[PDB]
Amino acid sequence: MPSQMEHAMETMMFTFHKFAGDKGYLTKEDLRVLMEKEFPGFLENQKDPLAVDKIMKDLDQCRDGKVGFQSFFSLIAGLTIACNDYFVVHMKQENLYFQGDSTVHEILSKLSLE
Amino acid sequence: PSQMEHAMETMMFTFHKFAGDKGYLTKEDLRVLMEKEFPGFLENQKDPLAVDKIMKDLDQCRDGKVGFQSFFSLIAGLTIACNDYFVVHMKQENLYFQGDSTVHEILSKLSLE
């Protein structure tokens, strides 16, 4: 009986710890693996093989090879906020119904890192 | 069916469900959102002004309107705090917690500074 928001939060918490493991942080490689499983289209769609390295570089509180949870959350903030802006510009006015397990995947394919 | 992509959709569409056409949340919209999506949370706070206080502490929140990034900073603040709690009290510790939702349980342990 968790609400939808509570379960979403739990998903994000547990996803971090799944790839972080006991050391409690993500290396660059950890983050790469995380992204390839959780944002399947995404890295490869970018026309840049240093994409994860650039992302890693632009994550708040992220400076000695390690990505903590707060830093991990800033990644999700950046992605979701950009997805929302796309949705508001291009999708919201155009349909009353949106597909679950589909729309954010579709929008992520439209994004590139600055 | 990526769990992360699903969770993002939840956060985006939850905001728009409660913000409606105007595309932002009022204090009242936020109160109704929190009451449904963080059941028990506000009531557990010992404070009839908890929502007013929360708004005050949101990011890019200045004229009575909560936009999406503002909303996201609320989710961030709650989730980061839940994670700190989890790391300290539930992860290594060892566990045997049998609730249906660990985030529901941890949320009942938080208050605003």
Partner: peptide, 8 residues
């Protein structure tokens, strides 16, 4: 919180 910028 610093946030990376993605564009479309």
């Amino acid at each position: 919180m610093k946030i990376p910028k993605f564009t479309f």
